C-alpha cells in the first residue's frame, strides 16, 4: 500500500499472508475455517505445494504466536483469463481448519450480484510495497469506488487529491466496503499510485454463488 497507514494490530482478523520460504508474496481472505480466497494471478506460476497460508499475522518481521500456519490442500479456480484480466479469483482449501479467535476470523461476503455505486467508501489493505520494500506492518488505505477507466468486470477504486493506492505484494488482498469483502486486489495501471488509473479488484459479489457452492 502506497500512502496508506499502519493498521491497528489484528483490526482485520480475516486478513491472510500467503508466503513462500517465510516470505510474503500475496494477501488472501479467510472465508471459512478451511478456505481462503485470493487472486488467481498470485498462484498462476507458483507451485502451491510450497505455499504457506499464514493467519493471525500483523508484523511480518516479528515472531508472532497469534499466527496459525496452513498448507494448501486443493485449489478451486473460476476461469482466470490473464489475456482479458478477468476472473482473477481462486479459492485455496487448507490442510486443516483455522481456530477462530480474536486474531483469526471469517470475513462476511456480499449478496450475489451486488454492485457498488460511484462514491462508495472502502478500505484497501495489505503488506505490499510502501512506495511507487514490502511493509512490515499491515497497511490500510481509504479508497473510493469509481467507474471511470473501469470495466463492469471489476470493482475499481481511486484516492483523490493525492497519489495513493495498492502496490506489488497487495495482490490477492481484500477490499472491504460497507463491512463486506467486495474486492480482491487484481491489477494496477500506470504503476502504483499513479493518481490517474483506478486500482482494479476482482468483483467478489459476482462470484458469491460460486464461493458458497465450495465453502458450504
Ligand atoms: C501478473 C502480475 O503479477 C501482475 C501484478 C502483480 N499486477 C499488480 C501490481 C501491483 C498491484 C496489484 C494489485 F492490485 F494489488 F493486485 C497487481 C499487475 O498490475 N499486473 C499483473 C496482473 C495482475 C492481475 C491480472 C489479472 N487479471 N493480470 C495481470
Ligand atoms: C497443515 O500444514 C502445516 C504447515 O505445513 C508446512 O508448510 C507446508 C507448505 C509444507 O512445506 C510442510 O512440509 C510444512 O510442514 C502443518 O504444520 C500442519 O501439521 C498441517 N495440518 C494437518 C496436516 O492437519
Ligand atoms: C476511512 O475509512 C474508515 C473505515 O472504513 C469503514 O469501515 C471499513 C471496514 C469499510 O467497511 C468501509 O466501507 C467503511 O467506510 C471510515 O471509518 C472513515 O470514515 C473513512 N474516512 C473517509 C474520509 O473516507
Ligand atoms: C469501521 C469504522 O471505523 N467505521 C467508521 C464509523 O464507525 C464512523 O461512524 C465513521 C465516522 O466518519 O467512520 C467510519
Author numbering: 16 to 36, 38 to 63, 63A, 63B, 63C, 64 to 90, 92 to 146, 150 to 166, ...
Paper text:
Introduction of a ring nitrogen at position 3 led to 1,4-dihydropyrimidinones, which were especially potent against HNE. For example, up to a concentration of 50 μm, amide 23 elicited no observable inhibition toward CYP 2C9 and CYP 3A4. Due to its overall balanced profile with respect to polarity and potency, BAY-678 (20) was selected for in-depth in vitro and in vivo characterization as a chemical probe candidate for HNE (see below). To confirm the exceptionally high potency of BAY-678 (20) and BAY 85-8501 (29), we measured enzyme reaction velocities with different substrate concentrations at various inhibitor concentrations and extrapolated the inhibition constants (Ki) from Dixon plots. Both compounds revealed (substrate) competitive inhibition, further confirming their binding into the active site of the enzyme. Beneficially, BAY-678 and BAY 85-8501 revealed no inhibition against 21 related serine proteases, up to an inhibitor concentration of 30 μm. In our complete series of co-crystallization structures we observed an induced-fit binding mode. All bound inhibitors from the dihydropyrimidinone series were characterized by rotational dihedral angles of the northern cyanophenyl moiety of ∼90°–135° with a preference of dihedral angles of ∼110° (mean: 111.6°).
